[PDB]
Design a binder for this molecule. Structure first.
Ligand code: YCH
Ligand code: NA
Length: 263
């Protein structure tokens, strides 16, 4: 059966032309609101949270790891390198790579995080270790954003990603300093103003990571702190039938506006 929330999300989806996936977790009582919550969607850059978190986890036993410089060579640059392009024939530390990947969605930075973990399978292995049985990372940047209909590579479900984001930021999948660092990075994101944040009250604190890819894939995952209330986790994934479709961040803002009612 459906609630009024799910009915509103279905109407938004119908108007949008695409396929919408939503998962809300209310940490006051662990209740969940799901819309296509167990369908797979292409993660695109939302996968960068798992990669950064995996490096944070490594740093719990190698305590200087975030300070380690990593060389950036011309050959490393991919399709979207806003921060890494300033360091060609130079370096960025693992902390700097994590900040660039998360806060600017730099794709070269993500490739360095993936390499630090031994490849896409190392990111997936971290996911499994923290209890995410759904996430899979198969490719590096930029091919992980192809977002082809029916392709299971580089996908997860809204339910699984919301549970993981909760465990990484509000729970204890990471150590105490690492969890705080991830929260700081997500709160300082620069790419999210038109997505979930645009549908929520401006007084609420939000940490988020966006994603964009082919098939007009438009995603955002967020941890949300209303002022006088237990925090929430919200995943909004959206993908479209046409390879060339334009981005639809407004759909994510609209989904967030629906979900926020009564919270
Ligand atoms: B993620 O999705 O955020 C931006 C970049 C563009 O390739 O990837
Ligand atoms: Na940066």
């Amino acid at each position: 059966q459906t609630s009024a929330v799910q009915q509103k999300l279905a109407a938004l989806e119908k108007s949008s032309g695409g396929r919408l996936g939503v998962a809300l977790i209310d940490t006051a009582d662990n209740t969940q609101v799901l819309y296509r919550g167990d369908e797979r969607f292409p993660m695109c850059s939302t996968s960068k949270v798992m990669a950064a978190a995996a490096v944070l986890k490594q740093s719990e036993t190698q305590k200087q790891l975030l300070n380690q410089p990593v060389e950036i060579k011309p050959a490393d640059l991919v399709n979207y390198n806003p921060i890494a392009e300033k360091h060609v024939n130079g370096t960025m530390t693992l902390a700097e790579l994590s900040a660039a990947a998360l806060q600017y969605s730099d794709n070269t930075a993500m490739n360095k995080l993936i390499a630090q973990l031994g490849g896409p399978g190392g990111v997936t292995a971290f996911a499994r270790a923290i209890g995410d049985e759904t996430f899979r990372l198969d490719r590096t940047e930029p091919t992980l954003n192809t977002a082809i209909p029916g392709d299971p590579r580089d996908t997860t479900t809204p339910r699984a990603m919301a549970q993981t984001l909760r465990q990484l930021t509000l729970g204890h999948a990471l150590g105490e300093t690492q969890r705080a660092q991830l929260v700081t990075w997500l709160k300082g994101n620069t790419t999210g103003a038109a997505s979930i944040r645009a549908g929520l009250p401006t007084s609420w604190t939000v940490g988020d990571k966006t994603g964009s890819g082919d098939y007009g894939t438009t995603n955002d995952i967020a941890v949300i702190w209303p002022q006088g209330r237990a925090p929430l986790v919200l995943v909004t994934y959206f993908t479209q039938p046409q390879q060339n479709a334009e981005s639809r961040r407004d759909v994510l803002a609209s989904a967030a506006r629906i979900i926020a009612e009564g919270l």
